[PDB]
Design a protein. Structure first.
Length: 10
């Protein structure tokens, strides 16, 4: 996965 962008999928 990616470090950031952890506030969209979940």
């Amino acid at each position: 996965g990616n470090h950031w962008a952890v506030g969209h999928l979940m």
